[PDB]
Design a protein around this nucleic acid. Sequence first.
RNA 1: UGCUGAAAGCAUCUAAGCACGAAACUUGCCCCGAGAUGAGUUCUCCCUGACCCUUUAAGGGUCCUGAAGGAACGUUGAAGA
RNA 2: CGAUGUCGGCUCAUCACAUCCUGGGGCUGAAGUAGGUCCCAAGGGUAUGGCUGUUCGCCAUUUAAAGUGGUACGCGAGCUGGGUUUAGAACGUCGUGAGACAGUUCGGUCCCUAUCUGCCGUGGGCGCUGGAGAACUGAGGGGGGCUGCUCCUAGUACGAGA
RNA 3: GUGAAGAGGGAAACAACCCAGACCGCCAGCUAAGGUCCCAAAGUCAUGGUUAAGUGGGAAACGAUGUGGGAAGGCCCAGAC
Lengths: 209, 37, 175, 141, 58
Amino acid sequence: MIGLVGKKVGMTRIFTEDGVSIPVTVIEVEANRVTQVKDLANDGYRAIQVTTGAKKANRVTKPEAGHFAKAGVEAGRGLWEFRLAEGEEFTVGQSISVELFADVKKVDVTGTSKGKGFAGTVKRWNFRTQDATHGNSLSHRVPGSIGQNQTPGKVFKGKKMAGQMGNERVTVQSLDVVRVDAERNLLLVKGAVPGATGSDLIVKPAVKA
Amino acid sequence: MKVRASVKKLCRNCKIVKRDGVIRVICSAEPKHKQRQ
Amino acid sequence: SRVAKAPVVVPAGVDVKINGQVITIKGKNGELTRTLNDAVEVKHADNTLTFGPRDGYADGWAQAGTARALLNSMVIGVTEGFTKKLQLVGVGYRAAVKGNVINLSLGFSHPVDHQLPAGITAECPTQTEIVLKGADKQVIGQVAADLRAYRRPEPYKGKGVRYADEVVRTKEAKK
Amino acid sequence: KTFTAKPETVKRDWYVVDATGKTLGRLATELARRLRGKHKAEYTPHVDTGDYIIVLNADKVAVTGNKRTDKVYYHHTGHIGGIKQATFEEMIARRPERVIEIAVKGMLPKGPLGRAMFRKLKVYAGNEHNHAAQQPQVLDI
Amino acid sequence: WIARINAAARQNGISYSKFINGLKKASVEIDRKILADIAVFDKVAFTALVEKAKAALA
RNA sequence: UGCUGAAAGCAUCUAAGCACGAAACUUGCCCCGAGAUGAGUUCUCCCUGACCCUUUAAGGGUCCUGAAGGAACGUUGAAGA
RNA sequence: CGAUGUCGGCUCAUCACAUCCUGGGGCUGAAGUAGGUCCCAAGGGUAUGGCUGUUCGCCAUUUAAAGUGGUACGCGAGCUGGGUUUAGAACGUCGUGAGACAGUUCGGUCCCUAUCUGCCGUGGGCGCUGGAGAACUGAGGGGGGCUGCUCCUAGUACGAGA
RNA sequence: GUGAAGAGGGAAACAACCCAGACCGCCAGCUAAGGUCCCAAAGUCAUGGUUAAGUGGGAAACGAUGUGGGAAGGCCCAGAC
Ligand SMILES: [Mg+2]
Ligand SMILES: [Mg+2]
Ligand SMILES: [Mg+2]
Ligand SMILES: [Mg+2]
Ligand SMILES: [Mg+2]
Ligand SMILES: [Mg+2]
Ligand SMILES: [Mg+2]
Ligand SMILES: [Mg+2]
Ligand SMILES: [Mg+2]
Ligand SMILES: [Mg+2]
Ligand SMILES: [Mg+2]
Ligand SMILES: [Mg+2]
Ligand SMILES: [Mg+2]
Ligand SMILES: [Mg+2]
Ligand SMILES: [Mg+2]
Ligand SMILES: [Mg+2]
Ligand SMILES: [Mg+2]
Ligand SMILES: [Mg+2]
Ligand SMILES: [Mg+2]
Ligand SMILES: [Mg+2]
Ligand SMILES: [Mg+2]
Ligand SMILES: [Mg+2]
Ligand SMILES: [Mg+2]
Ligand SMILES: [Mg+2]
Ligand SMILES: [Mg+2]
Ligand SMILES: [Mg+2]
Ligand SMILES: [Mg+2]
Ligand SMILES: [Mg+2]
Ligand SMILES: [Mg+2]
Ligand SMILES: [Mg+2]
Ligand SMILES: [Mg+2]
Ligand SMILES: [Mg+2]
Ligand SMILES: [Mg+2]
Ligand SMILES: [Mg+2]
Ligand SMILES: [Mg+2]
Ligand SMILES: [Mg+2]
Ligand SMILES: [Mg+2]
Ligand SMILES: [Mg+2]
Ligand SMILES: [Mg+2]
Ligand SMILES: [Mg+2]
Ligand SMILES: [Mg+2]
Ligand SMILES: [Mg+2]
Ligand SMILES: [Mg+2]
Ligand SMILES: [Mg+2]
Ligand SMILES: [Zn+2]
């Protein structure tokens, strides 16, 4: 359904009447606003493109500011797009309120990951390391052997080795929402949503619950 | 449900038929007679 | 062959529509359509369709008896009536009808809540005896078999869902 | 010294053909030799003498027998557990352009000029296109 | 050389095994090089040639 | 396992056709994904000067023009060899 | 033979299906339970220890299961060197002796920075035919799929009981 | 007998198999072994039958109302099934 865009600020815990310590996190969600409505005859697919946040005047560029003043909105910071289905009526000037999640029990959260650098073979793909003793020389952490002999006589495609760790788009699903905030524009969702704090995540109703 | 490459009739009600490239042997009142080629 | 040369009969009182293949026979029960394959020539003698192979085919007598038997079955379904009556067996096995629903308590934690096609008018004159009517014989045979064959009756006790007129194999657990 | 038809002087055409009711093996070799360009008298091997065809409604092409289902399409990708397979009826219901494009890709020759001759295969599977501005002629086969 | 000869033969409406047979009926000794070279430019004389083959057969 | 039913007037899941069927199949879940050369779709912002020379026009050069926007440099980061 | 390092462990796999588990159907000398036996099915999963140099094997103990094979009986320009294998020493036995013996204990140097194919990552130039700032449609690809047990139905059906 | 001491077209490639024995030059004609739907040159050439299984384009013991042709017999309007 119509997603929204938030920014993860911290992690805290909501307690209960009983004594449950529910882990929870606060994604601040301002009121997003429709920027470009598409459909099939206009572009090829029904969707919605939006933007929330704030960007400075002397670093919004002349291509972007024309698209801003073509709508009539403020100087936001991103450009995100949500696919849709039928049975909806929409315009461009109306801004989306923060209470669209106020009746959904299970949501989905996508975002970026953290950046763990050029990783290792014992670190990313969980290769069990070898003997740190007992004769063994200079092969404590290497990934060992990778191919057969002479038939194929090559390293197959789909192999796993060292590389960049994460730092891409990941997805956690079906999470638990406990509380909204009309006063200071928050969403409290149970768990540990991806990415470091100071990043912007894409939240939506859960695709299968 | 035998599988054999030498099928046969046994009783007086064995009906050899051919379905979908398979020479089946069946019977009206016998579960053991039921076959396949 | 021999049923391909022995032709059909058809009485009056009925809206005959032989538009070549689409022979819709609108009368007392209903009407059936079928777009036959074209390996048969057929004309109406106002009481009897002739049946034979159209000239040039290889397996011409394939359709020549089957389409004849089907055109017997369609017009006698429109004329008289068709069912093949079932009989539920078993204590704790009960069947209830409201027009186009079957509710069976066929030994499962969820009851068999099953639905019906267009050409089915079903009735239970007794709680375990159901009969489902219709005219299209090929459809009301298959629908009866699907509505029955959740449980073939097991060869020891005879407890299950069987036809009212079939044959079951009484078995013997030896000691 | 026999004449070698230089490319900047030789022309091109525009034909359309509605392949409904036509068989694959007896259609595709004619669409292969048309864009190979040998039915014209001024054919040369090493320089392209091709044509332009447009094959309309290519989701109707039929092969007789039982081979609407018994015609397989094997292709392997490069990741060791990844060779796949789709059959003829599924390829027809999914993408009815590649049922003709690979059929002419077989019979057309293989190389840089093979891909150059493939570049003119403007083959569709609908009942309209956007090169009628080029005023084509309805060829019959 | 035989390629453009067969091209012009299918262009005018005749095969190759009938064409060379009609020209052997007309007892010509002209080779594939110049039989192709006529069909390069002079289309009406090669049309006359296949008309002669059609008038030798028919 | 079926329904209808000839070949073979009868039984026949099969030859015409119609219905069911499992972690395998295509999807459905998710990721990098137009260097898809078959190179895309898509709403936006900028340049509306004079000329002579043989390359007679898709050509070479002198001058006000040098904007959209990016690169480089400094402060650096939950981005990083 | 102007040399392709050999058994077994450690580390990484991939395919095969004559399928160990799990999925669906027929037969039974199948009441239920659990099984017998072939037929379809290879997506996924497959024990930690004692003992010898050991794959196996035996034994102790789990689990749904502890599959069968090829890949130079996969893999030493990736790693142990215990096994068989060099030089020393001894016992049995053989020869008069020099010394031998799939007989045995004991100690015994495992070299190399990647040029190229390959594979996982990160990048500059140019093309996409006016040039630049972005957001995307997705033909194809790639990871993913496991299973235990307790409770409801119900101590129902089946069964003489159990 | 090729092949070692031998080139070339057909068997995809392929010393030994079939064709065949090239001293040099030519943008000349006829065929062999083998091929003529396009890749790659030449018949989607005509009558004419089998095949329905990609059989053609890998195999046995045995199996069967798959199928075409021939030769005899028994039962039959004393209607044989
Ligand atoms: Mg980082
Ligand atoms: Mg370890
Ligand atoms: Mg060392
Ligand atoms: Mg160390
Ligand atoms: Mg079947
Ligand atoms: Mg696979
Ligand atoms: Mg080639
Ligand atoms: Mg029958
Ligand atoms: Mg039947
Ligand atoms: Mg599962
Ligand atoms: Mg599924
Ligand atoms: Mg050497
Ligand atoms: Mg050696
Ligand atoms: Mg098997
Ligand atoms: Mg069994
Ligand atoms: Mg698999
Ligand atoms: Mg496996
Ligand atoms: Mg799957
Ligand atoms: Mg151990
Ligand atoms: Mg020990
Ligand atoms: Mg062991
Ligand atoms: Mg081996
Ligand atoms: Mg071996
Ligand atoms: Mg092994
Ligand atoms: Mg080895
Ligand atoms: Mg090695
Ligand atoms: Mg080793
Ligand atoms: Mg040692
Ligand atoms: Mg280097
Ligand atoms: Mg390198
Ligand atoms: Mg780049
Ligand atoms: Mg897939
Ligand atoms: Mg000799
Ligand atoms: Mg010699
Ligand atoms: Mg030779
Ligand atoms: Mg040769
Ligand atoms: Mg060979
Ligand atoms: Mg060759
Ligand atoms: Mg000579
Ligand atoms: Mg010959
Ligand atoms: Mg040709
Ligand atoms: Mg012919
Ligand atoms: Mg055989
Ligand atoms: Mg009798
Ligand atoms: Zn029997």
